[PDB]
Amino acid sequence: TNLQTFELPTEVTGCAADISLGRALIQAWQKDGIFQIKTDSEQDRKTQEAMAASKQFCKEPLTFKSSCVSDLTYSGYVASGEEVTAGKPDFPEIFTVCKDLSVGDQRVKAGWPCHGPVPWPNNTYQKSMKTFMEELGLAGERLLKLTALGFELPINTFTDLTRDGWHHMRVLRFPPQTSTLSRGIGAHTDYGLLVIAAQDDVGGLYIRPPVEGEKRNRNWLPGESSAGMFEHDEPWTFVTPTPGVWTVFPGDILQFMTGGQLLSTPHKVKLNTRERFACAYFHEPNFEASAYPLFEPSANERIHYGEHFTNMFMRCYPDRITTQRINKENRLAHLEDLKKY
């Protein structure tokens, strides 16, 4: 189908035009599950430089790529076939960029789960990814202010949760299809407020729009994982590669906070006849923030964002050294402590 494309203002102030744009973003998510935002020359330049750094990294030998791994943070390399979605291996190779915290940071010294330094392959790759994520973050903040305005909420409702937010990025290369298996990544939802994504010309991303009457699992609950759900049921919309745009769709936290007025968009990736480069950026609450229902003030349910992130990454990577160290040191119990002390 034909997605909507919007140009965002550089600053969002709450004027009538901003409110109108927020209404339109919500309506596009409610109809299509996704929309596109137009990139300017610097946003595009930084996207292309990130893609170029990714292509150069993936040409390195596996031993080198596999050395870019940490037992403190999930940042770093994921080999093809290493990640699990709904009990099945996914086939991209990935470099994950989480908040880059040295062992001098007090949260790292305290052993907080998932906190530690990015194992950058080199400093040029570091600069390219950080510069790109700075731009992605500015867009994320614009989008969150617009979304609040569209729901007639105070403009800072969501940005109040994203101060020092746990923003992160997956830098992906999908191999060409070389076996009978076409599955790149299984159907799933991502975990935070927004997913902002870029792709090259190859194509392979599919998203599921809202469907009237279709129950959607609440992926923050252990008995309602969204992984694998609807994988072989229509409808799925192909996200046609388009120059000069990023795509945007909601993550789990927006589904929870809006009581399902927005849905965390299910999506999957199919391998193509050529390798495919993409970057997915996650604009997230602070690790210590608790999401809450916006439209039910008496509702007691909350999502501790860092707990959700940690649970998800442990399920993605059950055998990774990062997960082993969480288990060995009982870092999930630390997470319980950091909530109160």
Ligand X SMILES: O=C(O)CCC(=O)C(=O)O
Q: Residue 32 or residue 190: which is nearer to ligand ARG going by CB?
A: 190
Residue among 45, 107, 274, 315 that touches ligand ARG (CB under 6 A): 315
Nearest residue relative to ligand X (C-beta): 278
| 262 part of the interface to ligand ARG, by CB under 6 A | no
| 170 part of the interface to ligand X, by CB under 6 A | yes
Pick what 139 binds: ligand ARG, Mn ion, ligand X, none; C-beta below 5 to 8 Å, kind-dependent: none
Q: Residue 135 or residue 190: which is nearer to ligand ARG going by CB?
A: 190
C-beta of 85: minimal distance to Mn ion in Å?
Answer: 9
C-beta of 205: minimal distance to ligand X in Å?
Answer: 4
Q: Residue 93 or residue 190: which is nearer to Mn ion going by CB?
A: 190
Residue among 101, 239, 316, 338 that touches ligand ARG (CB under 6 A): 316
| 239 part of the interface to ligand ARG, by CB under 6 A | no
Look-up of token digits 């809006």: 258
Per-residue contact flags (x/-) with ligand ARG for residues 284 to 303, judged by CB under 6 A: --------------------
| 190 part of the interface to ligand X, by CB under 6 A | yes
Q: Residue 94 or residue 335: which is nearer to ligand ARG going by CB?
A: 94
Scan residues 257-316 and list those touching ligand X (CB under 6 A): 267, 269, 278, 280
C-beta of 170: minimal distance to ligand X in Å?
Answer: 4
Spatial strand order of the sheet with 5-6 comes to 5-6, 35-38, 245-250, 194-199, 276-283, 168-174, 93-97, 76-78
- 188 labelled binding-site residue: yes
Stretch that binds ligand X, among 64-72, 117-125, 197-205, 283-291 (CB under 6 A): 197-205
Q: Which residues are annotated as a binding site?
A: 188, 267
Q: Which residues are annotated as a binding site for Fe cation?
A: 188, 267
Residues that bind ligand X (CB under 6 A): 170, 172, 185, 190, 197, 199, 205, 267, 269, 278, 280
